[PDB]
Design a protein around this ligand. Structure first.
Ligand SMILES: [Ca+2]
Ligand SMILES: [Ca+2]
Ligand SMILES: [Ca+2]
Ligand SMILES: [Ca+2]
Ligand SMILES: [Mn+2]
Ligand SMILES: [Mn+2]
Ligand SMILES: [Mn+2]
Ligand SMILES: [Mn+2]
Lengths: 237, 237, 237, 237
């Protein structure tokens, strides 16, 4: 299976697989069952922003999700990602729907990775920012139901012609270039990512969520990873 | 054939195809016959740095090549790259040798493209920098004789076991992700690239040189582009 | 007196001091009489963005001003700023009104200067960006009528309690730190600045305008520089 | 007294004031007696690099110091700097000698602070980099014995005309602009800093060390803060 590290914005509590009994943000290390979660009030129809931060010195993966009214949730988990991730990864955004649904619209996404050595501040780095997506966004690998287009947004999951989200959808967008997430020579390796999103639903309950993830470079959507599995995992173990 | 915009660091004067009769830096738009050249004193075995700068406002492609002793050559050419490049490109480095030879060693390479739009300092951007290359550099597409590895450098053209550069060599390195080099909405599209290089030769004359290039995404080394064509062009037209 | 290089967003034509007979963007080198102008359609009450770009290689100072509907005005002037600016400068924003008036509201301002030297992509650099201004903005030197605060904006010229802009107003905001704008060793000295602005008027004609400027470090608003002199010049020479 | 947060590279063990019995890196929150230390092998005459990283999400101040042979020490301490630092600070480098001495040469220094909000990735930021210092470095406030000059370095403590360091020296360099280190509206505030240094001594033991610090904007060298106090504190409490 793929190796996955992810920060989930999980809009649907699947308490039977260890989600807490509320919408939450979580840090997922090789399992959909988050190593750490925090309560998260998803604001239906509002534009959220998620920031994710790690470096190899503090070894603490942190995420904060906030909305324009000021409400924010934060989660941090102490982990040495050198022991989990492969040296080369792809980075991406993933989302799903199941029996319940929501728009999983990404309005912008930025990522920076840096490997800093012992010379000065000489550095390998990758930084990309999309504040608008294009129709034929050649620097993104879209998987599953994900599309970009003319409104300048990335729809991770399927949205019908009348605008409304669909159930049992899964899709992802990975930056096209592999990322050198660690390198043994480097003194510091850090990454950060930010994405803005608009989760809207008129369902009885929104589901399932959006994740920033880092995977093996050849990562593909696990079969059947709609719903609770966020397009990240083949199962809920 | 391919579409090419390039800044060449041309170490060998091929005066029969329009080179001036001295080593030179030149701006190449869709031909090896540079639209503009400046005399360049290549300092054998010294680490040089090249800076290439363009934006869509001034519409002037500029390059400087310099050495630590302060010697510099500059060339600028007024051109609207919107009418030459496709919207999506790959960026890269190329070098060659022919009857005369040189190492075409790249020590570092950075590139930044930005599209800045109708509104605030919001932006799509790509920035990479390599101050050390890896042995298996997964975010670089190596073509022809280009290799990376263990000394942290990129060797664009063939170098034998005994450290000596080979003749009739041609190699390139392209960044893995396509680059959105222009977009009609953008008020400013800019790019800049820096590379450091070490050209060293024990030949009677060093050849052929090194270029930073921007090409169609599917650009491949043209057949017969060793020597004076710098791995960029199928012919000298 | 002071030394000034400026890009003016000139909302009021003072044809008796060399303005064209339309609102315009212009590049000012040591005089209010712009060396170069382009016609500019100021869209009353709309948020505009200005980008100013210079480097020591192309020696071309360029500016574009644009609005979200896509309308743009560009001006570029070939000038070697090494022979005009002192080595150390302060950078800032200026605006004024006179008999006619307008708000001169700055919503954001960013600036980057870099000196890139004889060797690798090593560098002195300064980058700041304000996307929200604070009430007591300690890294800004406010002069004349300039104020910040609580709406996250910078008001360059006086605005009364009832939200209305005042006449005969002049104000500026300079970044607190001096900027090393050129250095003889540097192979590339570049700067770029972006600001977003909201010029709104209920006057018969809006005036005077907004400029990004670079000055001697000790620059102060010249006496009598309201109105057509944009808070930059002591006279119209 | 001033409020000080610092990362000390402490070359001299003053075990009577709580230093461990070896050279160490430490995190100092309002006291020279580090909240956390790690053993550090200072490499006499070698160029070290120090990286310091904090963000308001993880609330973990981390530092790593390394040298070209690969040896590195790291220290991290969990602290919410919002509860310690004033909103506006200056940032600086500090060093001292006492009865023993060393060169406290800084070869480069970079700093970035960012306040990120809940809009997109809109941000206030300050970033500066010095990879070479100038004689009259107008964007640095030198205090005590600190000087810059023509060799491109910052000597924090006194060095005699023959090149040799002096005892009982203290000096600091602060970036000229105040830094907005936190702001209640921001979702993330982060800072990072890197400096490279060359500590050389021919004494019986080198002393005393170099610190990156963040202080009240009006911070000055406490009287008598040579030696063990690193120019940071009026006393060893
Ligand atoms: Ca769930
Ligand atoms: Ca040639
Ligand atoms: Ca005017
Ligand atoms: Ca000590
Ligand atoms: Mn969950
Ligand atoms: Mn040529
Ligand atoms: Mn004018
Ligand atoms: Mn100590």
């Amino acid at each position: 299976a793929d190796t996955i590290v992810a920060v989930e914005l999980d809009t649907y509590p699947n308490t039977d697989i260890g989600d807490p009994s509320y919408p939450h943000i979580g840090i997922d290390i090789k399992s959909v069952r988050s190593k750490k979660t925090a309560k998260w009030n998803m604001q239906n129809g509002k534009v959220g922003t998620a920031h994710i931060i790690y470096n190899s010195v503090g070894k603490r993966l942190s995420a904060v999700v906030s909305y324009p009214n000021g409400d924010s949730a934060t989660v941090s988990y102490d982990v040495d990602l050198d022991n989990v991730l492969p040296e080369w990864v792809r980075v991406g955004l993933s989302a799903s729907t199941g029996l319940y649904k929501e728009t999983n619209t990404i309005l912008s996404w930025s990522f920076t990775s840096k490997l800093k050595s012992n010379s000065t501040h000489e550095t390998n780095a990758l930084h990309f920012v999309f504040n608008q997506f294009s129709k034929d966004q050649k620097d993104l690998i879209l998987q599953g139901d994900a599309t970009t287009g003319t409104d300048g947004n990335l729809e991770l999951t399927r949205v019908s012609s009348n605008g409304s989200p669909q159930g049992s959808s899964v899709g992802r967008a990975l930056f096209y270039a592999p990322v050198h997430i660690w390198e043994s020579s480097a003194v510091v390796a850090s990454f950060d990512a930010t994405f803005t999103f608009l989760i809207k639903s008129s369902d009885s309950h929104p589901a399932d969520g959006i994740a920033f993830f880092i995977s093996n470079i050849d990562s593909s959507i696990p079969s059947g990873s709609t719903g609770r599995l966020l397009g990240l995992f083949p199962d809920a173990n």
